[PDB]
Design a protein around this ligand. Structure first.
Ligand SMILES: CN1C[C@H](Nc2nc3c(c(=O)n2C)CCC3)C[C@H](c2ccccc2)C1
Ligand SMILES: CN1C[C@H](Nc2nc3c(c(=O)n2C)CCC3)C[C@H](c2ccccc2)C1
Ligand SMILES: CN1C[C@H](Nc2nc3c(c(=O)n2C)CCC3)C[C@H](c2ccccc2)C1
Ligand SMILES: CN1C[C@H](Nc2nc3c(c(=O)n2C)CCC3)C[C@H](c2ccccc2)C1
Ligand SMILES: CN1C[C@H](Nc2nc3c(c(=O)n2C)CCC3)C[C@H](c2ccccc2)C1
Ligand SMILES: CN1C[C@H](Nc2nc3c(c(=O)n2C)CCC3)C[C@H](c2ccccc2)C1
Lengths: 118, 118, 118, 118, 118, 118
């Protein structure tokens, strides 16, 4: 979509970004992405993931208006999952929780790209 | 079913394992993972992706009958697309090809799991 | 076709002209042509394109009844795509989008050069 | 296609860049694109057209091994057809010859894009 | 002057017009402006100058009694020198020739205005 | 003058180039040239004038020591006036302001050429 790349993010938009973000935080499968990875559960995590991400941190950025474009937002989200699938094994819960939450996200994202324009 | 996990791969199994692979080798979108990553293109690749995977390397492995359970061949397949979304940017052509191939694989693999049980 | 050049435009015709225009304004790939180019996007545009055109300026015209023959309407349409391809790079979005819609409008117009003879 | 944008043009490539070019110089409708637009035919042309092109200027460029990728060769071909539809009227001969000849180039170009994959 | 704008040109007017014009055609430096710019000298000229002009085209216009007010005769003359300084480099002879000739025109034009105001 | 063409610009030179440029911005008739032309005032301006210019861009350039010779500096100035006279009517004020200011600059420039040598 044109507008996703090009049309910048208004106060209205950011309002509905917080709305989507909260939906993720209340999701049943979000339990592994609400906060940052603990370096004690996994030394080498921050050493082998170049750009880690969580919803705790995406909440900061949505409240600090970090994202000039809907594009910078959908990147940082997809980090959460691409990073989770990369570091964990295909048969782990952490992986499954990411596959589920990403599908959900896309739906909650599809509704936001639609409600922007018409 | 997941007799995927438990039921060793027989010879007729390895049949559609090779056929499913030819079909990924055909795809117009398979080009990015037909062969191993060249480290002239990307020096730091091999140092930052832990278990690289191509389809050439995987095709060898279907010839050595490297795989005792279907579980193993699908781990190694999904490596390719997880490595790719990890290493590249989301709006990348590579990243789009992994998104598209994998969905293909998944439909071609859905077929295989059913043409094993009944 | 003879009918397009000499037989002029009935009150009917002008209904199925506004109806095709409508169809182009729906399309997914019509987004770059629904209104006039902005001069702040492109300060040289209006000085180097001799006859710009948009579906908004064309809805005005179809309504005002500006077009005596069908030849006139299809010119003003084709300005939109030839101007685009001229001013924008072959490999660009705007360009690709013009390709999609000229291809479409053609068939949506083949269906009008046929509802005007039987 | 990935190969078109990224694979550098070998000398075998260039051999049958000359074939595609001469097959176009042969065409029955290629006649108005063989040589540069004459300033006496159209005093404004070279002022109102930012980058003119022709098959002769491109025969020179294809001989002097000027094109690093296939991407650059098709860009200059489609200039001939974009500059033409832009400058001339939709109902002019020159305009139809670009319609006819580009459409043909496109097929010669399909056949060369697959002569390369293998 | 009020007269130059408002007082229509009569026959004795048009006779001073022709005297002024020939004085210019005589000038040591009128040479670049005696006739239309040749598109073979400068392919882009006619496409990048919206209203070219010459002392020849104007001598026709003075014979045809084309000018209703002195205002329009002066306008078309200042086109010659404006279009020349615009198109050409300032250190060029054509640029210098317009600088000189116009200053000449101006003294001759002054004369003509008081040869009128009585 | 020899010195204007050949003798590069010292730090002292540049001091008095800003001195002159200031004087221009002081002038009551500088008002149409103090900053760049607005594309919304005039959509075609930037597409049909090839090298625009303004005292604001010229201040930047004098502060970046962009001009090796007094010759480049005086060109860029004279764009402002030639561009104005070309795009606008002889009888317009923008035109009449270009005239007045250009005459001024010449005088201020006369004095700067003279303050260089003795
Ligand atoms: C901080 N801590 C991070 C956890 N999330 C996570 N930890 C690791 C990886 C990973 O990919 N993720 C997504 C790879 C390495 C370790 C979720 C966890 C949690 C535990 C119990 C009840 C709810 C939540 C809290
Ligand atoms: C062998 N060589 C490997 C390339 N594939 C690839 N290169 C890189 C990454 C990646 O993720 N991939 C999948 C990240 C870093 C660089 C594809 C390339 C190729 C070019 C044109 C037509 C087909 C194939 C050939
Ligand atoms: C009005 N404004 C005009 C744009 N269209 C356009 N702009 C330019 C060219 C061109 O060829 N086109 C078609 C070349 C020069 C710049 C479309 C744009 C738009 C942005 C976001 C979402 C929808 C629409 C809005
Ligand atoms: C050199 N001269 C150029 C002509 N081609 C051309 N002239 C013009 C435009 C244009 O778009 N084209 C393509 C717009 C402005 C005039 C073709 C002409 C020719 C005549 C007969 C047999 C072959 C060739 C040769
Ligand atoms: C017809 N042809 C036109 C020339 N004049 C001219 N050519 C150009 C520009 C321009 O500004 N001018 C005034 C800019 C673009 C090229 C003068 C030329 C001539 C040469 C020698 C002796 C007398 C006449 C005759
Ligand atoms: C930025 N904006 C540019 C204007 N200057 C200008 N605009 C145009 C042309 C031109 O030639 N000039 C010199 C032709 C095309 C439109 C002057 C204007 C202004 C208005 C009031 C008080 C001071 C300044 C400011």
């Amino acid at each position: 979509d044109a507008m996703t790349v090009l049309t910048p993010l208004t106060e209205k938009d950011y309002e509905g970004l917080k709305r989507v973000l909260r939906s993720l935080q209340a999701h049943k499968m979000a339990w592994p992405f609400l906060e940052p990875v603990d370096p004690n559960d996994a030394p080498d995590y921050y050493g082998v993931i170049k750009e880690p991400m969580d919803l705790a941190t995406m909440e900061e950025r949505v409240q600090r208006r970090y994202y000039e474009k809907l594009t910078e937002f959908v990147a940082d989200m997809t980090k959460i999952f691409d990073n989770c699938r990369y570091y964990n094994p295909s048969d782990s819960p952490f992986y499954q929780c990411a596959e589920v939450l990403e599908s959900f996200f896309v739906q909650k994202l599809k509704g936001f790209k639609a409600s922007r324009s018409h």
